[model samples]
Target: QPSTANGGFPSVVVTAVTATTSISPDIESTWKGLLAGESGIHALEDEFVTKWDLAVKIGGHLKDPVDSHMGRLDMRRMSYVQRMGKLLGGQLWESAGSPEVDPDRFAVVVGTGLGGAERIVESYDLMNAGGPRKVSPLAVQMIMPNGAAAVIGLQLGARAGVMTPVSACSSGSEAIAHAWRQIVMGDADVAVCGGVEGPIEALPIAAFSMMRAMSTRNDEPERASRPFDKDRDGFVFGEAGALMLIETEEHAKARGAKPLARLLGAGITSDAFHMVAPAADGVRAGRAMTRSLELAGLSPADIDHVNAHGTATPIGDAAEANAIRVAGCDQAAVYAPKSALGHSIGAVGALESVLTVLTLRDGVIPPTLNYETPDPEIDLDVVAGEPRYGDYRYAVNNSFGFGGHNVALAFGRY
Candidate 1:
């Protein structure tokens, strides 16, 4: 039953899950980190945080900021994005027991909200001070948007197609969706897909400072990212790489791969209403959720959990709440992992999606670290105080980008 298009493959399936040192320590540590109120947001005084009277000064800075443990071969290619991307892709394949896939058709798709920003800023300064001759040769490869994907492919010896999506926050999820199409449409049987982002840099901090969209609680780094709380102000930027291995069901069966969940369907929409603001009614986002569920042959009621695109922003949270409600899925228990992980920018969707899938696998919803007090405008069952235990069969991962790009991906137990 293998079709020529998909190399005569069956439906796509998820065979394995892999991540870096950032996400291990067993299930209890993971759950405890959430319930104990760990916030990924932090306040920094690194030159710019103090210069701009920009209200927002907090971000989700990863611990040990630039600790690259990836191999020496990859270290030579060290742009922040490339490091995260190649490490994640390598981990996914390694976890899959190093499945042998057709190298020519083994595609890769990585969604990044920002790639090699650290390299870009460093290169810019070098150029300004020392001219072109003094610039590092790695500058171009480091800052290039496609640099991450290219490095990942080279490291993996993948000669198949490679795609890099830069759709703001939705970039990660959209990357997975696009990769799924390759497997589904018979263009490829397997795809190494997900997202990566690096925002702990001077230039991005300055830019976001100008936007006034960051937290400025210089005293408390962990408490800076307050989501859905009455005192919530702005989002805290977090960094990480979230990667997944998506393959045809037949290929997985043949290879004896353990499935995390099945990719039920994906929905994407755009609000031409504003560059930064959502539609007045939030109708577009709602439609995306509804349509995705419909395509999966499930009603909104079938959904048991919602991974909200809650960035702790005033407009963003309220708008997403409206969309979930309008889609008739508001009653489902919702949790914002970003509360603990902070907003990972382009890596947000893929990283959060991994957390969502893990929750489903463990049958326990992770706690929203900073949700002691809920916002009146946002009415939903947000998992707050402790981790919730339940037989959650289906869940939806939501991601909305700055340019009004909306996406919803539904996942379910196999």
Candidate 2:
């Protein structure tokens, strides 16, 4: 995975990438909210949360409805997560100006944690009330974790391939890594990579709460997810959908498309240490960072910022801090959008990658919200309070999932 394509890594550029407007069908709202250090996480007043007496009562949900014109018939067969994928995939395609590419050479890769959880739960309720006859006939299709990838593939007419990499929280970045690898390996000329997560339902909420992996700051939902802060409890669930359209630099330049950034390198690793906890020494995660730097032909000093995984859990944040230090990235300015965006599981990595590109593009690092108190043991330069403006080039995004999955991506300003 660390090997370069030809002289260096394949010149894959993010020709276009966009986020669903928490309101609009466009990308502006997401970035603006992040820069403003606003939190989308909210208190759950739902009947479902009340029924379970879940310890963590705060989460982030998509406020808007599905705005895509994919038709009711088509959408009904898809799950909630898949519909989200379609909306974002469509948004990304439209944002890319619906580029004219050979459908046969296009690829789609979508990642998710618990895809279509609502559909599964709904089907279960129906079956339990009556029998198998009451269950939706399309339940299997709708509940499949790859539904998002499959739906996005059909919409994009991606004949080269469609892939789904479910690595828990790291799934999104793993999708990015997989897509970039395919393009670099000459398997596809153009690819759409990212993730969409819609797991804010009651069951998943209770599950995470029971595991004590979510914030208990139901009193102040806005300040619940305090990534890297000494007072951090746990991450608040946030659902987000994002997509990136990347193509070979030659292909993009030949088509006169202004790329947002270069997908310079990626490294995927695993810590066989634990199912849900990071390696205490952070060696495996650091290996991922080192591998990405080598593949990108850069040093740790070349990275100006790190979009940290920063789950904000006591152990996870400290482990990531050690991971950065072990990789010699302690000098890099670290920004944890989970502090503001909450943790979107599979979607967070891709969304944060979008932020990293934006950070490189705008030369301003957004503040890590609620980073008022620093942890004594975690020694790192955190961007806090206000946006930090400067000239920057290279950046790294780290996404570690529950199953010990570690993925690191390197991006260079285009």
Writing each residue's lDDT as its tens digit, candidate 2 over 245-290 gives: 9999888988788998888889899999998988978889988998
Looking at model 1, report the run of 10 residues with the lowest lDDT sum. 19-28
Candidate models: Cα lDDT each: 0.75, 0.85
Worst 10 residues of 2 by lDDT: 19-28
> Model 1 compared with the native: what TM-score?
0.88
lDDT for 305 in candidate 1 is 93
Instruction: Name the lDDT value of residue 156 in candidate 1.
Output: 76
Error of 2 at 15 (Å): 1.3
Q: What overall lDDT, based on C-alpha atoms, would model 1 receive against the true structure?
A: 0.75
**lDDT: which candidate is best?**
2
* Model 2 / residue 250 / CA error / Å: 1.1
Give the Å shift of residue 179 in candidate 2.
0.3
